[PDB]
Amino acid sequence: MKFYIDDLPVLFPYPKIYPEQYNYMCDIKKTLDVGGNSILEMPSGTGKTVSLLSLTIAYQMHYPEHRKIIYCSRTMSEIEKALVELENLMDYRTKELGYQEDFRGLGLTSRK
C-alpha cells in the first residue's frame, strides 16, 4: 500500500502493516528530521528490515536533499537478505508508480 507520514509518502511493499512497523517508521522519520543518532529495538519477527528500507527509500526519493543510504549489517548473509528485501521493495515501487525510477542499490563484499 501507500500511506503518508507527515508530508512523506511511504510505499510499503505489503498490503498490510504492523503497528510496530508504523511507529518504527514514525520514530525513524522524526530522527531524520531532527538530525541525530537514534537507538531502536524492534521486536524480532516484525518487518524491521523492510520498514527501514521502505521509509529510507521514500525519504531519499521524496525529500529534495536526496541523502544516500549506508546500510551496515554484521553478516554477509544479512547484506544478502537486505538486498533481496530491497529488490522486493523497489519492484513494488516500480509496479505502483508505473516506471522504474533512477535508483542504484548495491551490496559490497570481498573478492572471495
Place this chain on the structure above:
Amino acid sequence: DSLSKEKLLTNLKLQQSLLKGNKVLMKVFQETVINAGLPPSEFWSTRIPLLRAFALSTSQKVGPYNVLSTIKPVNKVNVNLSREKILNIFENYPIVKKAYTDNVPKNFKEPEFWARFFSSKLFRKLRGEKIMQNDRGDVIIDRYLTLDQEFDRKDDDMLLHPVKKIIDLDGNIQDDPVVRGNRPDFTMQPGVDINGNSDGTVDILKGMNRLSEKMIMALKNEYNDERNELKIDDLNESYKTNYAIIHLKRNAHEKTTLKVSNQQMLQQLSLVMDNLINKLDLNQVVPNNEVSNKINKRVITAIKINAKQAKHNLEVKSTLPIDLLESCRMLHTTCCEFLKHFYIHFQSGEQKQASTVKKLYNHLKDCIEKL
C-alpha cells in the same frame, strides 16, 4: 514407470508371486485361464489394482536411520540382527558392504564376521564413540579404517557444493579477509591434548554431520527463490478461496408415461360444515359385516404375500451335496468372469478388438452349452 498398467500386465513374475500368495484366486485362475483358455492379460486387466497392491506391498522400503545407534548391547550380551536391519547397515555404511563382499564367500562366515565387526574399532567409529588405543579392535576389520577415511573424503567430495548467500557462512567469515583481531580463547577452538594435537571430539561431530548429510542426500534420487523465502507471508493478503458456486434450476419436466368449480367446492365444504355441526356419530365407523370381510381378505392376502416373501432373507445352506455345490459355484464363477470380460470388450467400442469380442462370444456360447 514400473507401476503402469502395461508393466503390471507384462510382469509375469509379480503375477505369479501374488498368485502363489493368494489362495482364493486358485478357484478363479485354475479353470478360466488354464482349462477355459482365457488370456492371462485379460484375467489381470480387471485385477490391476490387486496387482498394484501386491507390487506396492513389497516395493516400498524403510527410510534411512542410524541403525548402529539403535543397536546397543542388551558376562554375555546378546543383540538381535534382522535382515532389514543388516541391510540398513548395508546402505547407510557402504564400507561394511565392501567388508561383506570380499570376505563372506571367501574366508569366513556371516555370524563370526559380524562378531569381528562388532568387536572392532570400525563399529565404534561408525557409531560415533570416541576411539581410543587400548581397545583391541579386530585385526581383519581394522585394516578397513584407512579405506573408510578414504570413503569419507569421497563422500565429502560430492557432498561439498556451493550454497546460497543466505546460508553462506564461509562468505560471512571471508567478507573481511584481512581482519587480524585477537585470537579467541581456548573455549572457542576444538579441544586439544597435552601435546596440542586434536583429541578427536570434532571427529565424531564430523561423523554425525556426514551421517545426516548422507541420510538427506539418499532422499535426493529418482525415487528468485530468495525473494520467496524472505517474503513475509503474514503481511500479504489472506488466501481467497476459488470454490465454484452452482445455481440449480428446479423447472423439471413433469412425469410422463376434471377441474372442480369454486361454487360446488364451496357447496361440498358447507355440506361438511353442517355434517360436522349437527352430529358426528362415531358409531357410524363400524362396517356392515361384508365390506369388513372383504377388507380383511385383502389385508390377509397382502400379509400372506409379504410373509411368503420375507419368511427367509455367510451364505445360507443348500439342499445340494457339497461336491455339486462347489461345482456349481466354480461354474458360476467362470460364468461371471467370462461375462465381465465380454461386457468390457463389448462396451469398449473399439473396432480393433472385435475379434476378441467374437472369441468371448464363442466362449459365452460354450459356457451356455456347459451350463
Place this chain on the structure above:
Amino acid sequence: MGILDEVWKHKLILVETPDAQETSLALETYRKACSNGRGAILLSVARGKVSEGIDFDHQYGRTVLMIGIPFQYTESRILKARLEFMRENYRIRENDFLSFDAMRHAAQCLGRVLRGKDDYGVMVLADRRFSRKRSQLPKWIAQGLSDADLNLSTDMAISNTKQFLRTMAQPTDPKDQEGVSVWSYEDLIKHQNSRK
C-alpha cells in the same frame, strides 16, 4: 552415555563445525530436514558463526534451547583488561558488563526463531542464573516471559511446551487479529486520525 541414541530416533543431529564449509552444509541439511519433516536438531555455539546472521523461521525454528548462559571465559586476560577499562572509564561494573554481554548473546540467539507474527516457537533457557536476568532481557521477550516461568523444571516446561504447540497449531481468528496485531490501510488511516 547414549543420549544421542534416542535423539537419533526422532531428529537428525547436526553440529556446528569450526570449518565454515561443513557448517554451511550442515545448516543446509538442517533446513532440508526441517522442510521435508524428518525432524532435525542443530547444536551450535551461542557466540559462533551460526548465532549471527542465520535465521530459523517457522519449521527451521520452533524451539531455541539455551544450554546455560553464554558467558565468556572470565579469567582471560583481554576480557579482564576490557572490564577494568570499563570500570575506570564508563563506570560499568564487572558482573554488570559480563551479564550484559552474555544476556545480549542469549537475546540474539532467541531472536532468530521469529519472522512474522504467524511464526511461533518456544525459547527455553536452561540455567539457574537466567531467573534473576528477566529485566536484562529485551522488552518484548520480557513481556512474553511470565512470572510463573522464571523457575521452571524440565517436566512442567515440557508440559507447557506441549500446551503451547497444541494451542498455536490451531488456526488463529482473523476477527481477533483484524485490527490489533496487523493493520490494513483503513486501520492505519483510522489510527492516524485518532492520533491527530
Place this chain on the structure above:
Amino acid sequence: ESPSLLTVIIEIAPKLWTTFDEEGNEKGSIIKVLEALIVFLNAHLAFNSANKVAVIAAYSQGIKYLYPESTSALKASRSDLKIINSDMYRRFRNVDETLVEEIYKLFELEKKQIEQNSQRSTLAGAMSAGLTYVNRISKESVTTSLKSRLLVLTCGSGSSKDEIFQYIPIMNCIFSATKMKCPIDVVKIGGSKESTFLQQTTDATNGVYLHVESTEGLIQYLATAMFIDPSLRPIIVKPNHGSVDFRTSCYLTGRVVAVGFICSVCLCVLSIIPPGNKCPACDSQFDEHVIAKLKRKPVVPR
C-alpha cells in the same frame, strides 16, 4: 411395553376431496375419514395409558396443528361445542373435541380465504413438521423411552398427478425418520393405485403403505394395518403390497429412468444426453471427448 407418539399427517385439501367426492358415489367423505381417524386415535390412546397423539393438517395455504391446539388459543381460552358427546371417556374426549374444533376452525378459515387457489401442496411441509414434533417430544423425554410413528393420510383422487417438487423434501423426511427410527405409514385414499414417493417413504422408513379406494370401512384398515406400535414392528410383518422399484424421473423427459446418466455436479437424472452439451438443471458445459465415449456404439465383427 413402551409408549409411543403417533403423529398423523392428514392432507385435507378441499380441491382433492371435492374431486374424490365427484369421482365416488357418496359425498362428504372428509367426515368419514375424520371419524375413522378419531376412532383410530382413541384406539391408540387406549393401547397404552402414557402414549401420545399429534395431528397436523396440510390444507391449501399451509399447515396447522389439530391436536394439541395452539398455545395462544390455550391462553386466550373455552367455548366447548357439543359435536362430540360428553358421556364418553374424557381422556379420549378432550383429544377428540380439540381435533374437531380445530377442523372446524381450519375449514372456516379456508372458507374465508377460499378465493385463492394454489398449486403448491403442503404435505411435505406437514411431514417435516411432524418429524420436528417427534424430535421435540423425544428430546423433551418427559416419558422415558418413547417410541414414535408417523401416519400419513393423503388422498390422490385421480386429479393431482405426481409432483416433482415434492421429491427432495420427502427424501429428506425419509432420511430424518430413518435416523430417528420413526416409521412413516401412508394411507392413500384415492383412485391412482401408485404413489411412488410415499411408497419409497414407507419401504425405506420401515412403514406400511396402504392404498384404498373407498372411505367406508377405513377404521378396519387403520386398526388392522396401521395399528403397528413400534414396540412390535420387528415381530409383526407389514401388509405393504406392491414393492416399489426406487427409481426416479428424468429431468427433461419425465419418464421413469432405466440405465441412464446423472450429472456429476448437481446429481440430476437424465435418460438421454441433453442437447446443447450443457447440464439442464446445473448449467455446466460437458466435455465432448467423454460424452463421445458415452455415445460410442458396441462392437461386433461384420
Place this chain on the structure above:
Amino acid sequence: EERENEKTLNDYYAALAKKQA
C-alpha cells in the same frame, strides 16, 4: 492340493516361457 497346483503354475510358466522362446 498346494503341491500339484504349484506344479500347474510351474507348467504354465514353462509354457509361457516357451511362448516367448
Place this chain on the structure above:
Amino acid sequence: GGYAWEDEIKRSWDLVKVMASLVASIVEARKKRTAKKNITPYQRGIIRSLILTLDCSEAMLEKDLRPNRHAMIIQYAIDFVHEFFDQNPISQMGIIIMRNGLAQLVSQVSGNPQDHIDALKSIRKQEPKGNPSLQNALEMARGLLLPVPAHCTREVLIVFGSLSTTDPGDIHQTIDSLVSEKIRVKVLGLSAQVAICKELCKATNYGDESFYKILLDETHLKELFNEAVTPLPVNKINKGFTLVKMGFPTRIFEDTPTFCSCHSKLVYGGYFCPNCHSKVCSLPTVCPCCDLMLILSTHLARSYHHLMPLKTFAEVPTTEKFRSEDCFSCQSRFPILKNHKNGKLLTSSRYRCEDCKQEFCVDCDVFIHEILHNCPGCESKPV
C-alpha cells in the same frame, strides 16, 4: 536461607473469594452463529474416493489420549466409516496404516463399509510399533487413487500421530505427483503442527491452509472426524464435468436362493442390474458383470442437502414485533426469557427463516439444519 516449612501457611480456603450469565453465554452463542453465517452453495464433489491413512507407529503408544491413541483413533475411525458411508453412500474408500517404516493396506478400495469395519476391528487388536512413513503412505494412496475415474474426486485423509516422518526418498516429489494427479490431502494431526503436512495440505488443496487440522480435546477430535465426512468444495479450475453412466437396479424377491454375481455365494434376495440382469448383494456397488454403477434413489438423495444447503435461521430482534408465541413446526412456547430484571424479551428463542419468515425454537433450529434438511415453513408457503 530458610526452609520450605518455616514459611507462612497457604490459606487455600482464604485464597478463594466469592446476573448476566445468560448474556455471557449468548454472546458466545452469537459468536458461534457469526462463525456459521458464512453459508454459500459451494459445488462439492459428491462421488468421492477416500483413502483413510492411519498412523500406527510408536507415537500412538502415548497415553495422553484415553485409553491410548491407537485404540481411540481406531474407534473414532469406525464411527467415521459409519458416518461417511451414511452421508456419502456412492463414495468408495480404502484403508492404509503406517507401521514399521512401511505403509500397509488393510482393505482395498470398495463401496462396502462392512469390510472396512472388519478391517479396522482386525487392526484394533494389533500393537502399534515402528516409525511412520508419510511418503510410503502417500505413494500407496496415489496407487490406490490411480484407477479412480475422473468424475470421482480423489481424497486422502491422514490421521497423523507422530511429529516426524522417515521417508525412503524425496517427499516433495510425491507431493508434486499428488498435485499432478489431482489428489486432495487432509491431515488430522494429533500433537502439533508439522510443516511437511501443512505444505502437503496447502499444495494439494490449492493454497488452502485450512485442511491441516490439529486436535485440542477428544470432543474436538470427534468434531474433526464429523467434519471429515462432508464433501469437499471443488475448485473453479476443475473442468471434469461429465455424465456418469449408471442404472437403478430392481429389488428382486424370490423364495429360492441364487448365486450372486459379486461374491459367488447363495443369497435369497438381491438387485438385478438394469443393463445385464446380473444380481448384486448390496448397494451402492459397481456391477461386477458389466462395470456399471448400481445405486438407489435414496443414495442419490443423500447428497442433495450438500448440493443446496439450508440458509441459517436469523436471530430475531428483541424490539421487533413477534408473530407467534409458539414454534411453527414444533409449537413449543417461546418463554419470557428475562435474563435479568429489566431484560424483558432479550435474546428471544425465535429463529426467523429468511424465506418464509417463520419463527422456530432452538431445538427445531438445530434439527432442521442438522437432521432434517428442509424448512417446513418454506414448504408450507404456497408458491
